[PDB]
Design a binder for these strands. Structure first.
Lengths: 52, 85, 84, 51
DNA sequence: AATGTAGTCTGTTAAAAACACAACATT
DNA sequence: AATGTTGTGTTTTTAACAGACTACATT
């Protein structure tokens, strides 16, 4: 099931700044890579953070 | 119940406090035309909310926006309106 | 300046808002606050709507012209707070 | 020289719905502001749509 | 060094405004 | 018969929205 960047971030053990999370997506640091569906990104509910 | 209450001594809501200011306003109005009231009420409620939330987040715009549930751009715009740039 | 609640003196509504929030912020025991703008707004909209509709003796058209919002908007705002 | 809402509207570059025209009066969007002369409005020939 | 923020941008879209029209009421 | 209201559609415009990003701050 897919989630918004906001939703996904708020579920994480340590929710971070939305701008930080975006910078990560842009840096291919979220897997599977969230996609821009119009105005916003869509994260896999269980998407993960990775090293750069 | 209503989380927003002004210590009237009892705990009467802000909803009631709004009704009273308007009853006084409508009375004070000497048949002058009223083209825009929503804004009059809104600007009177926004300016303090902002000043309060901003004080609470110790100046953090980002946090203040997250708290109010409005976009960061929106908070910035709202501040610039009431000369809090 | 034109909006004052008879506190007996004439203190603005701007001050009355600051006090309810000071009490709210204190009551909040470090709980996360996802949406406050709406909390404040719904608390200010519901009475405003009820005051004008009373003043216009139920005229939606006039009430809308007075508040400075579109008739459709007033209708929508009323339906929100179950005044439809 | 004064005209009826109907007359005035029909003269305009883009005549609109009469309901819309009567709405403009109500919303103070017509200058000089037309007034009900008895049971109905009198738009002055010089009347123009304002913001 | 990793993450957070003010400020200044972009484009997307939900919401408001504006316009319709069909009833029927008031003038 | 012109004008006003409510109820309900559309079309058009405005404003909130997510995000891009860089210099600097906090951690």
């Amino acid at each position: 099931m897919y989630l918004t960047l906001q939703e996904w971030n708020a579920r994480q053990r340590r929710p971070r700044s939305l701008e930080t999370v975006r910078r990560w997506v842009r840096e291919s640091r979220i897997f599977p890579p969230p996609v821009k569906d119009g105005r916003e990104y869509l994260f896999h509910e269980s998407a993960v953070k990775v090293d750069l | 119940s209503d989380v927003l209450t002004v210590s009237t001594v009892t705990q009467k809501p802000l909803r009631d406090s709004v009704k009273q200011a308007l009853k006084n306003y409508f009375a004070q109005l000497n048949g002058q035309d009223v083209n825009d009231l929503y804004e009059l009420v809104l600007a009177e409620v926004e300016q303090p909310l902002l000043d309060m939330v901003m004080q609470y987040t110790r100046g953090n715009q980002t946090r203040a926006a997250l708290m109010m549930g409005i976009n960061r751009g929106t908070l910035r715009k709202k501040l610039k309106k009431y000369g809090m740039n």
